[PDB]
Amino acid sequence: EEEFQFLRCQQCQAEAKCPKLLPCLHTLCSGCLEASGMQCPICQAPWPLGADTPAL
Ligand SMILES: [Zn+2]
Ligand SMILES: [Zn+2]
């Protein structure tokens, strides 16, 4: 467990208020979905999948 129970945008590298699991198995923040219109920034590199869940 960690001192904090929150997520972190893998594309913004900051606190995610309302992050979501993109259709490409990626983790983005709320603002990213609205701003990036559900884009695919994490698709920039073949990152290791298998871990993608919402915030507590
Ligand atoms: Zn973001
Ligand atoms: Zn992608």
What is the 1 CA–ligand 1 centroid distance (Å)? 23
What count of Cα atoms within 13 Å lies in the side-chain half-sphere of residue 35? 10
CB atoms within 10 A of CB 22: 21
- Experimental method of this PDB entry: NMR
Q: How far is the CA of 42 from the centre of ligand 2 (A)?
A: 6
Question: Considering only CA atoms, which of 26, 19, 15, 22 is closest in space to residue 48?
Answer: 26
Taking the centre of ligand 2 as the mean of its atom positions, its distance from the CA of residue 31, in whole angstroms, is 17
Range of the domain at 52: 1-56
Task: Find the largest Cα–Cα distance for the chain.
Answer: 32
Number of domains present in the structure of the chain: 1
The response to whether 18 counts as a known ligand-binding position is no
DSSP secondary structure string, the chain? --S----B-TTT-SB-SS-EE-TTS-EE-HHHHHHSTT--SGGGS----S------
